[PDB]
Amino acid sequence: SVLQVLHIPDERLRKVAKPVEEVNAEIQRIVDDMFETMYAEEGIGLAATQVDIHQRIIVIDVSENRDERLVLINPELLEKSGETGIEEGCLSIPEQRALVPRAEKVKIRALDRDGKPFELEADGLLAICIQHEMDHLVGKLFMDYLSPLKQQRIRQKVEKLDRLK
Ligand SMILES: [Fe+3]
């Protein structure tokens, strides 16, 4: 099922997700609905927080052919290095983009869809996407890195778009 993605302003986007206690059938079903939602909404990443499920679950697919499913359950950042930035967008901040500072490379550890631990080193777009999704799980959005004024304008623009429905 395609789930509803929350849009700012919405306080549920600021909630801190709790760790997943056990990767069971129910968690797998959430992972699956999150990928369905992410693809339907044309995204490359989605955090559970964005679909009002406050557990540490992230789905990502940054591949050209949309066939490389990465699942990050209970991810932990182990190392990071460098600095970089691209104009990021967000499914919860429709049609707004802004350059945000990010580490260029990251190394994380997480559980996959089977509950198996794995480590992943990433750079480029994937490193940026991982940081953006991990920020969502602790209630942080990319606009938070921008000036107060820019944040105001972003919020006002999204509210307008959503009013036009
Ligand atoms: Fe996002």
UniProtKB/Swiss-Prot annotation:
Enzyme class: hydrolase
Obligatory cofactor(s): Fe(2+); Zn(2+)
Domain of life where this protein originates: Bacteria
Active site: E133
InterPro entries: Peptide_deformylase, Peptide_deformylase_sf
Binding site for Fe cation: C90, H132, H136
GO BP terms, alphabetized: co-translational protein modification; translation
Activity modulation comment: Inhibited by 1,10-phenanthroline.
SUPFAM superfamilies, per database record: Peptide deformylase (SSF56420)
Protein name (record): Peptide deformylase
